Amino acid sequence: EVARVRNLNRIIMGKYEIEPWYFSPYPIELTDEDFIYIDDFTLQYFGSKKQYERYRKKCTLRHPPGNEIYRDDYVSFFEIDGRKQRTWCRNLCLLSKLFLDHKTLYYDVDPFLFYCMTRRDELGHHLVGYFSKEKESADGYNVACILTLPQYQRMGYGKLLIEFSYELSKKENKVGSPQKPLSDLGLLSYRAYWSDTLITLLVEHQKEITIDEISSMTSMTTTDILHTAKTLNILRYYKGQHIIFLNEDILDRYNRLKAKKRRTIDPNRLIWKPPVFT
Template sequence: GLEQPKELSIFEINGSEAKVYCQCLCLLAKLFLDHKTLYYDVDPFLFYVLCEVGADGAHRIAGYFSKEKASVENNNIACILVLPQHQRKGYSKLLIDTAYQLSLREGKVGSPEKPLSDLGLLSFRSYWTQVLLQTLSMHRGNVSVAEMSMMTSITTDDIISTLQSLNLIKYWKGQHVISVSAKIVDEHLKANSRASLRCDPTKLTWQPPSTQIE
C-alpha cells in the first residue's frame, strides 16, 4: 500500500512573487477541473499548497486552494484541487477548513467563489454541515444565525441554505429562526460523524497582512 505521510504541511505562496510556480499549479489544475479558466494572471492571488511530508523529508504536493488577495465579494476560496491519487484522504475538508481559519483570523466571513461545481458544492455542504452541527451541539441549539456566522466565518446565506437542507431552520415573522432540539442535533451529528482532518489553529503561523499584499 501507499506509505502514510509522517506529517502534512501547508505553505502560502504569493502569485506575484512566484509567478511561474503558481502558473504551473493552475495548469496542473486545468488537467482535472473542466471549469478552470485562470492560468496566467496569478498576481492577484495567494496559493495555499498542501504537501505530504515523507519519511525522507521530501514535500510532495497533494493539493491546493487559491484565494484573491482582495475579494470584493469576500470569497475565501477561488479554486480548490486535490490530486486524484490523494483523494478520499480528507484533504478537501482540510483545505476548506484552512480557508475558514484564515477568514477567522482576518475577522471576516467568507464563501467559495460561485458557481460551484456539483462536486464542489457537495464538499462545502458536507463541511458546513459538520461545523454547524458541532456549533449547535456546543450551544445546545441556543444560538442565532448571526452568532454562528461570527463563530465560524461561514456566511449567513451558506448557514441558512445548509440548515434548510437539514430542516433545522424556519422562516417565522419575517426572519429565519433555528428550530431544533438537542436530541435532533445529536441524531444529525451521528449521521454525519465521519472523522475529518481539521486545521489546528494553534499550529497556524499566519497573520493577516497589515497592508494589501502586492
C-alpha cells in the same frame, strides 16, 4: 471547441500516474507525447525523460516556494504569492486546470495567493491539494479555486482544505464563501462541510444561537448558513427573523459524525497574519 476535450494523454507526477480530465494550456507540443512528467516539487512539466533526469539532479527545492504557515503531524500549509512565485504558480495552475473544468488561465497569476497543503516525507513536502484566493475579492470570496489531486483522494484532504480556508477568514475577522459557480464535486464537498460544522456547533453550544452569532464563530456567510439549515429542515421564520432549532435528526447525525474520528485543522498551529497589500 478544442478546450472542451481532454488535452493530454497520461501524466506521471512524482511516483503516481494520473489521468487528466480536462483541457489545460500546456505547450501544444506536449500533446504529441505518450508520457508527460510533472516534477513533484516544482510542478515543472517535461516531455523528455532525459531532461527530467537532468532537472531532478540539479533541483534543490523540496517544498512549495514560500513560508510554512501551518504544521501538524498530518499536513502542512504554505502561503505562496502569485506575483512573487510566477513560474511555480503558473505550473500549479496548469496542473490544476487538468482537473478543474471552469478555472481560467486567461490572465497571469499575479492577483492570486495560493495556499498549498503538503504531506511530509523523507524526501520533503509533497503537494496533495490547494486552494487559491484573490488578494482583493470584490464579492468577498475566501476561495477562488480548490482542488485535491486525484492520487490523494480517499484521504480526507478535501475537508482539511475547506476547513483551512475558513480558519484564514476567522483570523481575518471576515465572513467568506467559495467563488461564483461551484463544480459538481465542489458543491458536494462544501455542503458536507457546511452541514458538519453547523450540526457540530449547534449540538456542542447547546443554548439557542443567533444566525449572526453562528456567522461570527464559523465565518460562514448568512446565505450559506440559512441554506444549510433549510436542507437539514431546522430553519423556521418568526416575526421577520430566521431561527434555527434542534431535532432528533441533528442529535443523531452528530453521534454518527463524532464516531468518524476525522483529521482536523488545529487553529493553534496556524502561525499567520493577513498579508498587507498597498
